[PDB]
Design a protein around this ligand. Structure first.
Ligand code: HEM
Ligand SMILES: NCCc1c[nH]cn1
Length: 184
């Protein structure tokens, strides 16, 4: 069961956040980890494409080098709070799992600035709730969480201590594919 009480950023600047460029996940807090050890890497891009708000996802597993992608049209619920009916796709946009009733995630932008952000997500897959996941984002992958986003972590009643860093986890990314998926 995810919480719905994550508060959107006051004065959220949606154009700066959804500018079509990549956000890297630098640190994350998964409140319901899979029983199997999975130290993944993730990044995302979001912005307008042919008049729609779109969000593409990338995940990388260093153990296998396996990759997975997703793309959604976003639906604004309220300011800074969105719902995404995802479809799983190859790096070229070919559909692996279609848009389905029980598959969706929601997110809230709790904090953001030109370079960083903190978001809450709640993922639903096959109708089941997979729990809360908080991500600290940055426009640069090797950048450490600065004071402002750490303040936002505190303001959300969390401890930065509990977060897991992707910094020396052998991550590799694919921003070209991630950006071009916005049109698919
Ligand atoms: C912005 C941050 C993230 C978002 C929006 C997000 C979103 C998603 C989505 C939509 C899926 C379902 C994919 C599909 O089946 O088509 C997924 C699966 C998964 N994600 Fe993430 N993810 C995020 C960050 C992360 C991070 C940092 C990790 C690292 C542990 C992670 C681990 C996983 C795992 C293990 C699964 C497979 C879950 C299952 O089917 O049981 N994700 N993610
Ligand atoms: N238990 C974490 C669910 C999740 C994975 N990705 C996004 N959310």
């Amino acid at each position: 069961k995810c919480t719905k009480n994550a508060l959107a950023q006051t004065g959220f600047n949606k154009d700066k956040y959804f500018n079509g460029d990549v956000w890297y996940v630098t640190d994350y807090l998964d409140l319901e980890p899979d029983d199997v050890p999975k130290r993944y890497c993730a990044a995302l891009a979001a912005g307008t494409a042919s008049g729609k708000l779109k969000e593409a996802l990338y995940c990388y597993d260093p153990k296998t080098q396996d990759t997975f992608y997703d793309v959604s049209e976003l639906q604004e619920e309220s300011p800074g709070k969105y719902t995404a009916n995802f479809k799983k796709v190859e790096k070229n946009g070919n559909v692996k799992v279609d848009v389905t009733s029980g598959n969706y995630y929601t997110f809230t932008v709790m904090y953001a600035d030109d370079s960083s952000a903190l978001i809450h997500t709640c993922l639903h897959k096959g109708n089941k709730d997979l729990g809360d996941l908080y991500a600290v984002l940055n426009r640069n992958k090797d950048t450490n969480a600065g004071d402002k986003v750490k303040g936002a972590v505190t303001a959300a009643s969390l401890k930065f201590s509990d977060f897991i860093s992707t910094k020396d986890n052998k991550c590799e990314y694919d921003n070209v594919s991630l950006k071009s998926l916005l049109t698919k």
